[PDB]
Write a protein that binds this ligand. Sequence first.
Ligand SMILES: CC(C)(C)[C@@H]1NC(=O)O[C@@H]2CCC[C@H]2OC/C=C/C(F)(F)c2nc3ccccc3nc2O[C@@H]2C[C@@H](C(=O)N[C@]3(C(=O)NS(=O)(=O)C4(C)CC4)C[C@H]3C(F)F)N(C2)C1=O
Ligand SMILES: [Cl-]
Ligand SMILES: [Zn+2]
Length: 201
Amino acid sequence: SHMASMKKKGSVVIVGRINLSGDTAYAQQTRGEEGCQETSQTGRDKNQVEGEVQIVSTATQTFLATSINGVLWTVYHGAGTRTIASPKGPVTQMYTNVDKDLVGWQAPQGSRSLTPCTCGSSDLYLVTRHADVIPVRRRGDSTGSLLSPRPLSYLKGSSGGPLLCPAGHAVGIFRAAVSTRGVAKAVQFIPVESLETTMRS
Ligand SMILES: CC(C)(C)[C@@H]1NC(=O)O[C@@H]2CCC[C@H]2OC/C=C/C(F)(F)c2nc3ccccc3nc2O[C@@H]2C[C@@H](C(=O)N[C@]3(C(=O)NS(=O)(=O)C4(C)CC4)C[C@H]3C(F)F)N(C2)C1=O
Ligand SMILES: [Cl-]
Ligand SMILES: [Zn+2]
């Protein structure tokens, strides 16, 4: 009840990226923990942003965010309603949908966006925060099976990451794992058509 001392939550901060520009996928860190903490409080991130898949952090969580159609998308269970840090200060979400576990901000200047897939293909690839590229067979509008199951630990921290088609288009945003006895056999994702609906109107 003491408003004068109520705290403010920090901004989401870009702390690195998944480099997909060459023949090898690899994670790059662009900001260490101290700078991340400062940037979360000010909301002012002067780092140059590059690429399609960002590694992002709050004070308590780290996950991914993916640019599609000029929007940097991630999961609500990671970002909540938080702003993202940018060169001129905190940027408010332009999309928030808790029912889809989805949020989005305008894509950062310097980022590149994935194109929404129109291939109608079921052979997908999940990109993790460790730059592992995991083949996934699409099994429905929002699920796909891992060709090689993996412990949940392998996938933790990769919500917000993309599923891509063979042509490198965005098919979806990783949301939740389908896990039994700690082994993830499948993944559940926000399909790009749901993003496009959220964007259209
Ligand atoms: C058992 C399990 C594997 C932990 C869990 N499975 C699970 O629930 O499966 C069911 C059955 C099939 C689909 C799914 O239907 C329920 C829908 C869940 C949801 F996702 F839509 C979701 N909506 C929310 C909306 C608002 C607030 C909180 C919400 N919380 C949610 O789910 C929560 C979160 C999500 C999660 O952990 N995501 C990942 C991740 O990396 N996060 S993260 O980066 O480390 C981090 C926590 C920093 C942000 C990708 C999976 C990684 F670990 F593989 N969850 C639990 C799970 O995946
Ligand atoms: Cl959805
Ligand atoms: Zn495609």
